[PDB]
Structure formats: structure tokens, C-alpha cells
């Protein structure tokens, strides 16, 4: 592409028509609503867990995505590799806000279920989630052709679902819940990045970290 | 204010929590709604009229804002200096869209009223507004015999009001109309620029030109 | 195009590889250099003169660019329509800086020469340019196939040339002068906007106003 | 910190005066130059190693920065925790470009030295660095028996040094090498982010991933 592409002020100022929101705006929108269930995606929503998925790929399938169907990978991923996962600031702020509200907090992930998992502990510890707000992580798995999260959102009566992927937002849509998008960091190993805002949903500002 | 201030990617990626919308999205939101009255502020909403205001300030009050109280200025500004005003593309798109809907187009301005005005003609001609959708400019304000912008919005049953200033949005909200913000161009002489989105209202993307 | 196009943080943070500079950085780069000749383009560099060109087009050739070859247009443009031209802040700052330096200031424009012109006066007055730094505007004209500015930059020994158009920067290149780009405002009627930085030249930050 | 802070187009279009460059532009600047030594900082320059530093801080000093002085941490960090570090694309492109030139690739780190290290292997493997271009990581610093980064750049005749921290740029400048800045990712745990461009140096676009 051109050595010196240049730019112009129409481009510099250009904004995609995205419904951006802040955590404060979300909290304000909920003012006075009693405790309810809310849910969070995990990967690239509350944890930058690319370190573990990157290790998994290099270890289990350097040339493919097969590691994601490998039980030996999931056993490592769910039982300690989140020691290297970096909690997202947007998640600290959202989880603190939902604890303030007295909301029930659920995590619903496309990760595969394993025999044991330490992920619930990592989340409760890192985010300072009290026992009463915390719920064990739901490992909904990944099955092409099905949104495995939708039925879980329904079963737990989740009213807000935060996530980075299109299927997080459409899971919320499927059940009539409010789907709010978090930006996936640009150094995530899960590419391409989704188009945040592509269902006209709210997207949290500065939510890449 | 360092010579080399530098930057960082948090700053570079930072977004204000604005509800950005497009003309297409606004149109979509009105699908199936019958013809209705809509209204526009003039200055920095549909016309970049700073050229006449710049000339007016230079000619009539170079050291103050007194020109805005000078009938000699307004007679000039409302009877031909808009030949030098630059129509905004955002306004061309909105007015085309509303005309296509069969909506009534109103312009409500805080410009001081004059004996005659040719601003209505300028607007109909520049924006190709059909006679059936066109309405003579309304001069609203707080002088004896005048009615306020809010009062005129109620009178004409204006359901959507477009403008760049805080007072355009509040005038709409006070009567329960939908106030939609247009960005004031950075080379406008009316400074400082407003904080578009300051009341949580919709702001049209790229609406500075 | 899509109703809800969305975005992602790689896009939000993306920067074109442009050599951006500030006026302070330019002045610093010149520290200790004795008085020299410098030159400025006029339209969209020091004056937002779109009001006059817009009036000219609508008056003289609503359906074409023929007004730009019409002597009756130029006579109006160069003898008063700049009363509506809005001086650029970047130009105030650059002209003040060159006056500080004791530099000779030239304006070299692609506007056509007329029998009389009041543009030199408008510039000296609006920018507070002292007699000794000021020089009468050079109306170099426009002739496809020739950069009419290059020979003028050579004749006046201009060492820095500021401008918004590609031919301003290449005029400076032609003569071995330092060509520095100003951003053309997005509400200029001269479209399309140039790609600032496309010759790897310095571009002044925030220079659209 | 208003609930609805709004924005304006001056802010939206605002650019810091940074000398942005691309990898293509850097390569172009070296055209015809024979093979030379170039060097890279490691952390947040070529590896997003925050996962290991995050784990290290949690494990060894949750309430302080003491882990960076703890030999037990460094033995872990330099002997396998980089399996969880994420290579930066900007580094893949730069290292490919320099390898293609036949340049010598050096890595100079302020990480504390350890009895053994497998970081050199991680870097050669991840970046596909041929044995003829590869050099074992240099641990530079101010401990007895060590030499500083500046000293190592002189020793190896490193002509270009890439890094994200101020000290990477100053170490280059102190010995007359070309210091080129890479953006630290916003989800790095090393905070605050540096002001890339703080010394007027080149900064690589989009170099946060
Ligand atoms: N420099 C400017 C530009 C626009 N306006 C607005 C638009 C109306 O014409 C006028 C109403 O007083 O003020 C202004 O006050 N000053
Ligand atoms: N959280 C972090 C991340 C990186 N570094 C840098 C990179 C080197 O590994 C180390 C040198 O002390 O510090 C750090 O100090 N702290
Ligand atoms: N590089 C990858 C690939 C997948 N996943 C996540 C998203 C899915 O929900 C789950 C199974 O694919 O793991 C991830 O975080 N990073
Ligand atoms: N819409 C336009 C068209 C032209 N010009 C300028 C640039 C040229 O130098 C000169 C003759 O075209 O006028 C302008 O400012 N605006
Ligand atoms: Mg996810
Ligand atoms: Mg207005
Ligand atoms: Mg010009
Ligand atoms: Mg570093």
C-alpha cells in the first residue's frame, strides 16, 4: 500500500455511528431497579486470557484450531492457566457496580466443561466478588450452529449480558435481555476482532483494557 | 505544554460515551410513522453562516459582541449575507430524508427578526425543499411579542428538532420532542464549541460539514 | 452501507503514518536561523475563503467550474468577498511566529490576477503583519500542466512554503524549499480533500481551523 | 466527570504532534544501506509479557513491586513464563524486514539476569529468526559486573534501537543510535503508559499489537 498514504480532516474526525456508553451511564440507567441476575462472558470480556489460549495453540495445535476441541487443552486452561490471565479494568468497574446494586453475578463462557475448574475461584478472588453475589462459572461450550449461551441466560433469568463476541450480544437478544458489548483488545489472539455495535447494541467506551 | 508531548494508545483509542447515530439510523427509527413536523436550527445546523457573522462582527463591533444587538447587522445578515453561508451536507441528507417521508420542514431560529428576510428563500433553494414541505423561517426568542423556541415547537407540533446548541436540545426536551444534536464546525466563529451529547441525546456522526 | 457498521479497537486506535508537527516544533526547528523569506498559500491555508467561492459558483456557474475562469468572478473575489473569509488560527500562529523571527512573508496564490486587489490589505490587517514583513500578494493563477507557484518560490527565495494542496507542497519540493501542509477544513467547498502527508511532508496538527 | 460529557469536533479531530512512521517507511529509509546491527527491547516491544509479570506480582508481592527484586520471580520469568507472552505483530514485521536486509538482530533487556534463560530461544522460535541473524539476549543494567543498555548498544554497534520506554529512546540517543518508539499496549500491567514521542523520536503506527 502507498509509502505515504496521507490523511484528511474528514477521515480524522470520522465516527462510526456506535451507541457508546460508560459504566456510570449504565449504573444510572439501572437507578432504583432492585437486585436482578446479570451475566458476563469471560474471555476478552473480564479476562485477557490470550496468554493461555496462545500457549494452548502452540502446545496442542501450532498449525490449526484443533486445540479448542482437545480435552487436554481445556484441562490446562481451566485449572491454572488463568493465573496468567489479566483482569480487565472495565470488568472490575462493572462487577463492583453490580455488587453495589446487590445483583446476582453469573459468568457464562464458551469454554468447554472440565472435570474440575479453578476459574470461578480466580474470578471471585480477582474481582473481590462476595459469596452471595458469586455463582459458579457456567461452561456452556462451543457447538457450531447453536448459541450455547442463550438457554443459560434464560435459565438464570439474566437481564443484562456483557460480552465481546457477536454471539454474546445475540444470546442476550435471543432471550430479551440487554446485551452490552465490551471491546476485545487488539493484542488478543482471537482474530479477527468483532465489529462492536453491529447489532445497534450499547458498547462500553475504552473497554479494551 | 511540552514541545514533544507524545501520546499513548489509551489516549488514541479513547472514546467519549456519546450516542452517535447516522441519518440512516434516524430514518430507520421512523419507519412506518406517518408524515410529521420536524424542525431545524439554522446556524451551524444547516448553514455554516460564520462568514456573515465574522463580517458582521468585524464591521459593526470589532471589540465586542454588540453587533448581535445591532439592527443594522441583522438587516444585512437576514437579507443576503446568507449567499455566503455554506449549506451542511448533514442537513442536505436529513432534509432529503424528511421530504421523502412527506414531513413538514420548519426552521426555528434565535436570529433577531428584521423587516424582511430572504433566509427562507435561501433555505428552500439550497436544500431543494418542495413548496408543500417548506415553511417560512420562525424567529423565536424573548423579545416582546415573540414566543420562545419551546413554544414554537409545541405550536407547530414539531416532533424532532435538530440543532448544534444546548438550547436546541433543551427546547425540544422541555416539550417532549426528540432533540438530535449536530456538531458545530471547528472553524465556526461561535466559540467555544458545545459539548455535543451533554444531555445524553443522539448526536449525528460527521455532522460538522 | 450497513445500518449498524460497528467498529473495533484496532480501527479506533489506527494512525496513518503522518509526520505531524506543531507550530512550536517548527519554531524550535528554526531556532537561531536569521531572517529568511517564507511563503503561504491563501485559500484553505490562511483563509477559509469558501464563502466567496461558493457565492461565485452559484452566481457564475451553478452547474460547472467555469466561474474559476471568469474574470467577473475574480474581480469580485479579489476586491471584497474576502470580507467573508474566515482567518485560520493556524495561520495567525504561523504568521506571528514568522514575524517574531523577522522573516519576510509572501502569499502565493493560484487565484487569477485582477485589475486591483484588496486581498493584501485583508491579510495584513487580519493577521497584524507589519509593513516590513508584508509583501503584496502574488496572484500566480492556475494553468493545468504547470505549477505556477514554483517559479515564484524560486524568484523570492522562499525557504518554507505552507499550503493545503498537493501543488503547494510540490512547488516547495520543486525549488528545494521546506513544504509544510495545512489541513483543508472538511466544510470547504473545494473537494475532494487532499491527502495531507502524501509526499512524506510535515503536516501541522489541528490546522483545519 | 459528567455523566454525559459530550464532545466536539476540535477534540475529535485533534492530533498530538507525533512523528508517526510505518515499517515500510523505516525500510525505505535504509534502502541501499549494508547489513548493520539493530536492537530491540523485549517487554512491550516485541513480547506482551504482562501475563508473566501479572502472575509474578500476584504470586510474589501482591501489595508491592518487590517481585521485580525477587530472584525466585526472575528464574520463573526467564525460564518458561514467556510461553505465555504474546509476540507483537509490529515486531514480526520489523524483525522480518531486518532479517531480509541481512541485519544482525539483538535483544537488550533490563530484566534481571538469571542462572539460565530460555528467552533467547523463545524469541528465535516465535519470530523465526535464522541462526545467522540471531544473538543471545543481552541483560543490561546497573548491577556489579553489568553494563548499561547504552554501553551494550555501543559495544554491538547497534544503529537502530526499538523500544516502548523513555529509557530505550534515551539509551539510543546517548550513543547516537536511532531510537524508534513502539506503543505499549493499554492492557499492559506496566503503568502508566509512556508518552510515545516524548523526545521527538519516530513512533511506529499501530504498534500496540
Ligand atoms: N458567531 C455567531 C454565530 C452564530 N450565532 C447565533 C446564530 C444566530 O444567528 C444568532 C442569534 O443571536 O447567534 C452567534 O450568536 N454568533
Ligand atoms: N509490569 C511490568 C512489565 C514489564 N516490566 C519491565 C520489563 C522487564 O522485564 C523488567 C525489568 O525490571 O521490567 C516491568 O518492570 N513491570
Ligand atoms: N484464540 C482464542 C480462541 C477461542 N477463545 C475462546 C472463545 C470461545 O468461547 C472458547 C472456545 O472457542 O474459547 C479465545 O478466548 N481465544
Ligand atoms: N471551490 C474552490 C475552487 C478553487 N479554489 C482556489 C484554489 C485555486 O488556487 C484557485 C483557482 O482554482 O482558487 C478554492 O479555494 N475553492
Ligand atoms: Mg469472549
Ligand atoms: Mg445553531
Ligand atoms: Mg490553498
Ligand atoms: Mg519495554
Tab-separated table of N, CA, C and O and ligand atoms in Angstrom, chain B residues 43 53 67-68 74 110-111 189-190, ligand 1:
chain	number	residue	atom	x	y	z
B	43	UNK	N	-28.199	28.207	12.300
B	43	UNK	CA	-26.781	28.475	12.292
B	43	UNK	C	-25.979	27.332	12.908
B	43	UNK	O	-26.206	26.934	14.048
B	53	UNK	N	-21.502	36.318	10.072
B	53	UNK	CA	-21.279	36.722	11.462
B	53	UNK	C	-19.884	37.278	11.684
B	53	UNK	O	-19.747	38.264	12.427
B	67	UNK	N	-22.537	43.691	17.991
B	67	UNK	CA	-23.167	43.540	16.675
B	67	UNK	C	-24.424	42.685	16.689
B	67	UNK	O	-25.309	42.889	15.871
B	68	UNK	N	-24.495	41.715	17.606
B	68	UNK	CA	-25.663	40.835	17.715
B	68	UNK	C	-26.873	41.543	18.278
B	68	UNK	O	-27.950	40.975	18.282
B	74	UNK	N	-28.367	42.819	11.589
B	74	UNK	CA	-29.360	41.794	11.285
B	74	UNK	C	-30.029	42.008	9.928
B	74	UNK	O	-30.296	41.050	9.216
B	110	UNK	N	-32.998	31.660	16.574
B	110	UNK	CA	-32.875	32.748	17.532
B	110	UNK	C	-32.272	34.014	16.951
B	110	UNK	O	-32.003	34.959	17.724
B	111	UNK	N	-32.014	34.054	15.642
B	111	UNK	CA	-31.570	35.286	14.986
B	111	UNK	C	-32.593	36.399	15.278
B	111	UNK	O	-33.786	36.147	15.308
B	189	UNK	N	-17.152	30.718	13.968
B	189	UNK	CA	-16.730	31.781	14.867
B	189	UNK	C	-17.488	31.799	16.171
B	189	UNK	O	-17.202	32.634	17.039
B	190	UNK	N	-18.485	30.928	16.330
B	190	UNK	CA	-19.231	30.908	17.583
B	190	UNK	C	-18.556	29.928	18.523
B	190	UNK	O	-18.654	28.708	18.359
E	1	LIG	N1	-20.730	33.995	15.788
E	1	LIG	C1	-22.014	33.589	15.914
E	1	LIG	C2	-22.608	32.652	15.048
E	1	LIG	C3	-23.933	32.255	15.219
E	1	LIG	N2	-24.612	32.801	16.240
E	1	LIG	C4	-26.003	32.502	16.567
E	1	LIG	C5	-26.887	32.186	15.380
E	1	LIG	C6	-27.919	33.292	15.319
E	1	LIG	O1	-27.814	33.956	14.077
E	1	LIG	C7	-27.607	34.267	16.434
E	1	LIG	C8	-28.774	34.537	17.371
E	1	LIG	O2	-28.400	35.579	18.269
E	1	LIG	O3	-26.500	33.722	17.142
E	1	LIG	C9	-23.986	33.735	17.109
E	1	LIG	O4	-24.608	34.236	18.075
E	1	LIG	N3	-22.708	34.109	16.927
